[PDB]
């Protein structure tokens, strides 16, 4: 079982479900081999009824679609595609929250309201929208106007682009068209190019492709913005990961998909609930988090973390999932078959997200503390008909410290420079203590043993001295790993990044050091990490493609990753993918994504599926960021 | 060669393309099979980077998707992903023509006007936009404005939907959920449902898939609105069609797309140039359509139809096509390959879609004439070039009587009853001259012959006594055949709808008949279809699934035949699709859209690949809603 989860709690997961017949994920990956070459390389397209056409890789014909389509244009037509589908999730969760916004203000929704309102008043000094003497309440008013805005064609651009970037990144951007004029305009005009006998011009497609990441990337800036206006902006917490934070004695609720509107409130509803609880014979509610609403309520409020993206079936094996709290995006839809066999109660929330066989709740958020007590009380139903049911919980969880928002790393480098916060990062990273930056992102993935990519590269970058950040599915591998947890921090780090974890940490009255890895949040919140980089930028009077910080999508799944490393390189950030994207069987586009697009944006793409090799690709990305910059490596 | 097209010049081209040694789209369909199972079934899906999965449509494993999506699932989702990709297309061509009467009317782009003051102020009318006492110009601002803001969401939902279908149709599709909220906000919501770990419910999903393609039928109908504000509503015109139209001493200028934005433009300018022309040698430069902006042309210019669809290499194979002038959709990106081997001069003029190969001119609305003298002169010097070589054009061409918009047809009806128009037709349609009205529309395809399919259903549905009405390829297919020509009514048409169409030619001072069928236009044009439907819907006061009108995309091929179909279903017409979509592979899905479809909206699919059985089921459908009518039949 270590072939398909380095994770022991999952691996011991997988023997309970092979003698209780239980179909897994891996299962179902077993039996789809050999997989379709034509579309693992991506040749292959159905874009019309003329179809399905494919090109052989090498060899003879098929050689050309029956339109005409060359290899490049198939190619670039469907990743193009993927690329629209990522901005449409990010940027339609996004879109809830601007409504749930609007909608708190105007009082029509009050278990929802402004929380932070110091970043309220900053975004929307950001934004340009008038502060002095408004009521908060119609600040937020224009602040969601502004947001819903920026779905559409207007008199300027996506402002959730050309607002949150270095003025000089937004001038290379636009001197190569590649600034979103509007979300969903862009991914319509996506969807319009890449159908039959439209776009057909590797280059300008690919081309079209990076703007609609920017759309993406203004998508996630906009969803991490407006929760931390009505969920509150991060700050340092502790908490534990794994699937020992459930509890065979109390009602387990796991919050499962992205979106925490409905999350966040099942938080607050389920304390009030613990003398309900302890009535039906739990010791209280126990909710924790999958994937990334579990991350959400992690950041926010410590809630422990269950399991992530590729083993999330596994917590329901355990007999002790009481209920599971679906919103939408990379929830697995054999969830709904395995709960006949598991006795979990899943259940949909969303209009646009259900699944055959899953109880639906219609969530309103002008209702939600009705619909979180209905949810509750379905989940406490179910723990009592477990009473006296035999459950297998592994008795294995980390201890992680989480909660970086980018305003918590300002806030802690603050204490040992108060004017100047960055400046201790920045002379860290000149003198050496810290290399360089990487952001891991991203999901799991079947084709990869689970975690296995994140954490071998990871501990390569942090023996030389990378300060590592993680979100998502990477943040979720990370912290089962006890990359969070500052007690590893000698066994993990170099010694410069070990003196300047312990400095910050000690000035911030820990007497420890910050974990290994620092926890910036959910897949929305990478728009942390570029926020962060973008300060940097702007203290060094530089862009970003002269700075040592890259990414990796180590075990990448989702479209919406396929977005995120392609708004990462748009912005000038080296980009490792660790699975093959559907680029292979073109080779015209990937020197184009790999190599050409350096001379676009200054990011470009790194393929590189041998996690060693991966981890020295990107020290060799990042050490020539370092002598570009002029400094020892 | 009878076995690849049915017309009798694409088959002379089709052997002079063998002898010469130049690839066709047969040549490339054959290089294709046996194409993938899969694919053509519907069970495949790439929506991560887990895939591909596929299903076997039977058999053993594997059965279900990797991260357990079913059968059901993986082709709803597919064909959802067509809908939005359909919707993007007819969308991204309304909202360009949107942007283009805002231009012309601030004074921006004087190549481009209001043309039809009265078509303006019946639309502003239509969506509640004040008229008395306004300028035209801000009255057109207002009607802009508003096709822009049906992209997005709003207090309204999409005006181009509600205002024109019957109160009782948007009753029943508000009542399931199915009217649109926004264009652009429906194809990315699809996007989004559509992607990993989201919806996975067939019947969620198709709901959506129906939603989404009444944003594509907003599109179509915005568009035809905009275009003929700007360049006029049409009227009865006479023309021909087929590659004979094309001259061996002229210039000899292909307009090929969609949008005719570019392209009446160039039939203004092309008059303006013909003794530039004359001086290099030609006649003067003779303009010929292909595809929709060939019909956008012909219906109100009366420009010949070269060819269409998968026939369009076959003008370049003539040798006499010195210019191809491309804005986008159905353009094979063939051509700019071909255009090496046969001295055609194959031009690009939009951003979002180019050719590798082909000259781009870049297009500006404020600068058209300009940029259509530039492509001209290329045309020119192309057709110097060409002086003393030999070419082969078919001596092959149809009479073509074409322009019938809805306001044509109504005026033409109105010499027969002056303040009641729609009576005649309905006294016919009472009395049996008029059986039914059966909407061809849509591609050819090259799995299908031809045309085959379109000529053998309409010759038996004209027998039937059927008003046959067609746009788009399906108007292409007929008019090459003969079916726009009044000569051939004797021929085609059964003695009660011969009667029907020679009283209304004679009452329009024509000594002779109207056409066998009529041509209402482009693919977008297939709105003027609706707005005939809901007019005469209107009159009876019924609703639209209770009317002896059927649809038929004989031989679709482009994703926005599958939205045309969808939203033909859902309006509430039986829709015959004559190519199989990717849906075969669900039973389920299968049922939902040919049977229990018609519980939601009284439409629904009739899947039928054999013409004569197709006619018969599509006769059956008619003669049920005769009876639901309490008619004979
Ligand atoms: S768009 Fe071209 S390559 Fe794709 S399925 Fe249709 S014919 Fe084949
Ligand atoms: S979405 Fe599911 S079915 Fe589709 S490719 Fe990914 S794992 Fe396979
Ligand atoms: S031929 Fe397998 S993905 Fe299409
Ligand atoms: S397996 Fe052929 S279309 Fe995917
Ligand atoms: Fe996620
Ligand atoms: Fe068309
Ligand atoms: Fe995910
Ligand atoms: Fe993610
Ligand atoms: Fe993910
Ligand atoms: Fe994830
Ligand atoms: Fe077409
Ligand atoms: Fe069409
Ligand atoms: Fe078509
Ligand atoms: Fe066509
Ligand atoms: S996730
Ligand atoms: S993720
Ligand atoms: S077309
Ligand atoms: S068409």
Not at 178 to 193: C, F, N, Q, S, V
Not at 195 to 201: E, K, R, T, V, Y
Not at 254 to 261: L, R, S, T
Request: hydrophobic fraction near 40%; aromatic fraction near 4%; charge should be neutral.
């Amino acid at each position: 079982q270590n072939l398909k989860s380095t994770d022991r709690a999952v691996q011991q997961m997988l023997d309970k479900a092979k003698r209780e017949g239980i179909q897994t994920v891996w299962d179902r990956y077993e039996a789809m081999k050999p997989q379709c070459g034509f579309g693992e390389t991506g040749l292959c397209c159905r874009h019309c009824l003329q179809g399905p056409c494919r090109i052989n890789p090498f060899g003879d014909e098929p050689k050309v679609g029956i339109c005409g389509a060359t290899a490049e244009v198939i190619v670039a037509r469907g990743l193009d595609r993927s690329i629209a589908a990522g901005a449409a999730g990010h940027s339609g969760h996004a879109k809830h929250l601007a409504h749930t916004l609007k909608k708190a203000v105007q009082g029509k929704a009050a278990s929802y309201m402004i929380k932070d309102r110091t970043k309220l008043h900053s975004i929307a000094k950001r934004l340009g929208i008038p502060t002095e003497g408004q009521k908060d309440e119609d600040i937020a008013l224009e602040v969601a106007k502004a947001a819903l805005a920026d779905f559409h064609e207007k008199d300027t651009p996506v402002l959730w682009v050309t607002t949150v970037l270095p003025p000089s990144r937004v001038k290379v951007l636009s001197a190569h068209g590649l600034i979103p004029a509007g979300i969903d305009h862009e991914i319509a005009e996506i969807m319009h190019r890449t159908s039959m006998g439209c776009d057909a011009d590797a280059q300008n497609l690919l081309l079209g492709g990076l703007r609609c990441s920017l759309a993406d990337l203004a998508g996630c800036y906009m969803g991490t913005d407006l929760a931390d206006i009505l969920f509150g902006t991060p700050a340092p917490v502790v908490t534990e990961s794994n699937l020992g934070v459930l509890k065979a004695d109390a009602v387990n609720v796991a919050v499962h998909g992205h979106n925490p509107v409905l999350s966040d409130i099942i938080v607050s509803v389920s304390k009030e609930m613990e003398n309900e609880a302890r009535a039906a014979g739990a010791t209280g509610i126990n909710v924790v988090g999958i994937c990334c609403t579990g991350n959400e309520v992690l950041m926010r409020h410590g809630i422990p973390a269950c399991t992530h993206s590729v083993s999330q079936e596994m917590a329901m094996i355990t007999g002790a999932l009481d209920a599971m709290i679906l919103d939408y995006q990379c929830i697995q839809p054999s969830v709904a078959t395995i709960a006949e066999c598991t006795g979990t109660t899943v259940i949909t929330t969303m209009e646009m997200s259900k699944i055959t066989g899953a109880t639906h709740v219609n969530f309103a958020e002008e209702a939600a503390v009705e619909n979180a007590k209905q949810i509750l009380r379905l989940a406490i139903d179910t723990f009592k008909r477990r009473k006296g049911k035999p459950v297998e919980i592994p008795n294995i969880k980390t201890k992680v410290v989480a909660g970086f928002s980018t305003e918590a790393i300002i806030n802690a480098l603050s204490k040992l420079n108060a004017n100047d916060p960055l400046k201790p990062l920045i002379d860290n990273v000149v003198n050496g203590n810290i290399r360089g930056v990487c952001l891991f992102a991203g999901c799991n993935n079947v084709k990869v043993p689970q975690d296995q990519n994140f954490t071998t590269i990871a501990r390569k970058l942090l023996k030389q001295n990378v300060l590592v950040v993680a979100t998502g599915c990477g943040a979720g591998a990370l912290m089962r790993h006890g990359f969070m947890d500052p007690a590893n921090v000698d066994e993990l780090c170099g010694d410069g990044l070990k003196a300047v974890l312990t400095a910050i940490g000690e000035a911030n009255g820990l007497g420890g050091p910050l974990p290994p890895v620092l926890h910036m949040g959910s897949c929305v919140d990478n728009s942390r990490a570029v926020a962060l980089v973008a300060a940097l930028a702007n203290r060094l009077g530089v862009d970003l493609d002269r700075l040592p910080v890259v990414a990796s999508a180590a075990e990448a799944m989702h479209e919406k990753a396929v977005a995120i490393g392609t708004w990462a390189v748009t912005i000038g950030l080296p980009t490792h993918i660790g699975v093959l994207p559907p680029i292979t069987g073109s080779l015209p586009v990937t020197q184009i994504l790999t190599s050409s697009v350096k001379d676009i944006t200054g990011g470009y793409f790194i393929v590189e599926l041998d996690p060693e090799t991966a981890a020295d690709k990107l020290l060799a990305a990042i050490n020539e960021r370092r002598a570009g910059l002029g400094l020892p490596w």
